[PDB]
Design a protein around this ligand. Structure first.
Ligand code: HEM
Length: 212
C-alpha cells in the first residue's frame, strides 16, 4: 500500500477525535477570540520552529529529502510576522511557551535528532492539514475576529508560493510515495503520525483549560 494512503488510513480515526477537542469545536463555530487565538498561534510558532529546524538538519538525508519544500511549505517566517502582529515588536519576550508545547517540541527534536526516518510523520500531520482544513479554519478566524482580507495576523494560513493547495497536496503525496519504504519504516511512520495527532490533541486540551 502507498505511504500517503497508509497515513490517511492510520490517522482518520484520531483526526475525528482532534476535530472535536473542545478547543477545535468552539473554534469551528467561530467562538475563538484574541486571547485563545494568540495562545494557539504562539504555541504553533514554537512547534513549526522545532519542526523546520529538524527538517533543515535532515534535508539531505534520503529518508526525508523528497519532501523538502521550504519555499512552498515552511511556516516559521509567516509565524514570526503573525507574532509581531498579535504580540507587538517585542513578541520574543512576550510569547508563552506552554508545557504541552514543550512536550511536542521535545518529541520533534527526538525524532529529528535520533529517528529522522519518522520525520515525515510530523511534516505530514502539520503541512497536509495546513493545506486542507487549515484553509477552512483561516476563513472562520478571519470572520470571528474581523481580520482583513489582506492577511495581516493570518500569514500562517497563507501559502504565497503554492498556486493550488489541492494540486500541491497531490504532488507531496506522490513524493511521499517515492521514499524508501520497508514494512518496518511504514509501520513506525503511521504510528508516529498517530502520536503527532495526540500531541496536537493534548495541546488543545491544555489551551482550553488555560482559557477556562
Ligand atoms: C476542527 C478542526 C479541523 C477541521 C475543520 C479539519 C478539516 C479537515 C478536512 C476537511 C480535511 C480534508 C479531508 C478530505 O478531503 O479527505 C482535513 C485533512 C487533514 N487534516 Fe484536518 N481538520 C481539523 C483538525 C485537524 C488537526 C488537529 C490536525 C492535526 C494536527 C489535522 C490534520 C489533517 C491532516 C494531516 C489531513 C490530510 C489527510 C490526508 O489527506 O491524508 N486536522 N482536515
Amino acid at each position: 500500500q502507498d505511504l500517503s494512503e497508509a497515513l490517511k488510513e492510520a490517522t482518520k480515526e484520531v483526526h475525528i477525535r482532534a476535530e472535536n477537542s473542545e478547543f477545535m469545536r468552539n473554534f469551528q463555530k467561530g467562538q475563538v477570540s484574541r486571547e485563545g487565538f494568540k495562545l494557539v498561534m504562539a504555541s504553533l510558532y514554537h512547534i513549526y520552529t522545532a519542526l523546520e529546524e529538524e527538517i533543515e538538519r535532515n534535508k539531505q538525508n534520503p529518508v526525508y529529502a523528497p519532501l523538502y519544500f521550504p519555499e512552498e511549505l515552511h511556516r516559521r517566517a509567516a509565524l514570526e510576522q503573525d507574532m509581531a502582529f498579535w504580540y507587538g515588536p517585542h513578541w520574543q519576550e512576550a510569547i508563552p511557551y506552554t508545557p504541552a508545547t514543550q512536550h511536542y517540541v521535545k518529541r520533534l527534536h527526538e525524532v529529528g535528532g535520533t529517528h529522522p526516518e519518522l520525520l515525515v510523520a510530523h511534516a505530514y500531520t502539520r503541512y497536509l492539514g495546513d493545506l486542507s482544513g487549515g484553509q477552512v479554519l483561516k476563513k472562520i478566524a478571519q470572520k470571528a475576529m474581523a481580520l482583513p482580507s489582506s492577511g495581516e495576523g493570518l500569514a500562517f494560513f497563507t501559502f504565497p508560493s503554492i498556486d493550488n493547495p489541492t494540486k500541491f497536496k497531490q504532488l507531496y503525496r506522490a513524493r511521499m510515495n517515492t521514499l524508501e519504504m520497508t514494512p518496518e519504516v511504514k509501520h513506525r511512520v503511521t504510528e508516529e503520525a498517530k502520536t503527532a495527532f495526540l500531541l496536537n490533541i493534548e495541546l488543545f486540551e491544555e489551551l482550553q483549560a488555560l482559557l477556562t
